[PDB]
Amino acid sequence: AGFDAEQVRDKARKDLLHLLEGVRGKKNLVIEKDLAGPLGVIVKASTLRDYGVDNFFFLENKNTGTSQRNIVFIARGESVRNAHAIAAQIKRIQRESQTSHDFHIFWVPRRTLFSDKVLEEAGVLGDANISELPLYFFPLERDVLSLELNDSFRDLYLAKDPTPVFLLSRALMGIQKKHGLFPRIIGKGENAKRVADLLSRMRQELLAGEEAGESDRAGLSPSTTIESVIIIDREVDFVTPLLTQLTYEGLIDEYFGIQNNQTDVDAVRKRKIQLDGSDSLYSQLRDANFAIVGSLLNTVARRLKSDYESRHNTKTTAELKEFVKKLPGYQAEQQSLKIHSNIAEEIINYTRTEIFNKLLEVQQNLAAGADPSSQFDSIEELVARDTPLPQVLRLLCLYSCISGGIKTKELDHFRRLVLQGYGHQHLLTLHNLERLQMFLSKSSPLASMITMSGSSGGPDQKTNYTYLRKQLRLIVDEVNEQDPNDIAYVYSGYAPLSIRLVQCVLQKQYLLSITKGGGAQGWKGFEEIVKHARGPTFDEIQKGDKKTVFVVFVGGITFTEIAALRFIAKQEEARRNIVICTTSIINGNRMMNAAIETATFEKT
């Protein structure tokens, strides 16, 4: 009777297809590109053709074919560009046509007033059968739900757009509507609180309806199959995604970039690799520290080879007749192992370069607590060797975020290095990093960390990583990577603060043990510590056996954080079912790409 991620997939598929029925006859499909990916997780492209789709077209290509008569658009409705893009296309076929065509548009997840005004001041609003496609969480795994909002980080922290926060609230509210109110809403961070606030405002709006005869029968009471929801704001811990991830899936995302459980590679244009928990090999590989991937890859090749040789024993029909049956299951494992070898082998040559080791050296030194000034010459050498701008910016932001701002003298040298190394166009890139508050001067009030010494002052004072490093045992130089005993294995000695904060709630006994159920839940006993992380700390209460726990990340989560979280899910397998929710899957490069100006002072 509890929560199951598959019912999300099923509803998603059923709602889409039910709208395809609504459009009678065969149809040609037009999809927003960064929506096509996520869609492939809930529905087969096979299944779509059967429901009458002839050809597939990307919306941003402006090349919709006149093949079939019915043209169907599927795009996210919150997007200002998407509205214009479709509207432009509806004219690129009313003045180049051969027939009139009927136009259907499926807004995800809703039709917005803005969408209409853009469509209206082009006249094409009237010839449009507009329906809503309530997609929110895309179930990427059994324990991972993601809104798959790729620009959500830019939108939220730069553009100051409440849309991702809004959607996530709606998404979570959907969970409540089906399985009951979250008994507790525990969280940390400004946008985490915003999500909680939207969850209480939306709850009341459902009661204003039912009281005033809008009916809906009922009528939400506290759940019995959900323990709580824990909401973490990404802007509370920018450091973890900035660090170069050192798990297998992390490094794949760090180097190849993973989108919608997929990615592109060249060694058997390029080809699309599927990366999800289906592949039995990848399941075990993905969450492991990259060091032991060789050892793990070999052990499986060493075991596969002595499983092919095996069972030539009873050489009479049967024991061979039974062997050829289990034969396609060998070839798959054989082709999987070659892929995840080639990939591993390629990630290896990358980690052996002098630049990479120089990067890791600076990242590790800064995270460990070394004097950041000691990493200056190293950063300068990296700029001089023309290392990719994102990697350098990640260091500077890591530098800035971990030292409570940057010293005035060192700041000006850093700005000179970036500008004279990559382009004066990046006067804008640095300005964006300043608004994101990840590259600031020490003399800025926004750069200050939280201290119980420097009086009050500062409304939005930053996470004190220096304090939190000690108080929360952020550094574990122990941890063996062959058989991890702490989440700090995902960075080879560094435990992510974000997940460590989750442990302040979920694993109080363990967290106390390394610093020398029923209750008491909440932040109880870790109030002074969590006080030193950015933003509001909260724990609202809404009014038998194992229940599910939703760990929600507002503003992106990393593969390192997912693995670490999965590591905890196992340790808690007895009393809890942990389900991860997030606006998107984020990383250092996606974060930086949000701030980086691509214009160029060159020839047009």
Place this chain on the structure above:
Amino acid sequence: ELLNHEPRAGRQVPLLLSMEEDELALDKAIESGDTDLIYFVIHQLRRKLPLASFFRVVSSRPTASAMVEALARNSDGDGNEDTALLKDLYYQDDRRLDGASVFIREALQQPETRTASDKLDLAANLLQGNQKEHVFELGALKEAKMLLRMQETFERDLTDSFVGLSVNQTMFKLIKLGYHGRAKKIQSEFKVPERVAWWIRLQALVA
């Protein structure tokens, strides 16, 4: 004294605007988190108010200004701008950096170095009043104007692409092409750090 129990904090806003209670309507749309409700109040207010009064309302409230500002950089969508609106918004708010960045962003769209430097000049013109605090950005702008000139010079003399490259990138191409006399001029001119120049110089010769 009572916007009270009723109703759904979600359409007490059109009610609020019907009663010409400006800003209160806006605040309720912001509190709602609903970006659709927020745009709605913003679009109505724009049609209703002199822009200056509109600018004052939306600048007191970060989320509102943020959305006005976004839409100003996305009216096509993407690429094309409503640059006039932005300049006025930043001027009436003393957002001198944000206003300067608009001209800079425009310099990046200029097909010629002469026009791009002209936009860069405007960027600077906003910044000379103050002066302090903008010391770095004024300097950066002045640097960009110089490098652009020197690079078109290189383009004319040596007959190869140079305009648009970074300082470091310019030395590299100059060294890789054997023009050490010019590459040392760049270094001395833009005070390129020793460790950087030695590093550049090394990488170039092997290519």
Place this chain on the structure above:
Amino acid sequence: XXXXXXXXXXXXXXXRIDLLVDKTDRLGGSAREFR
């Protein structure tokens, strides 16, 4: 004879495993700490 025939069929079907495990070991056989 019958047995021999059966063995042969399996062999034909098989015709990487021998030179795959070794691939993997070389990668593994270097360091065990990103430190």
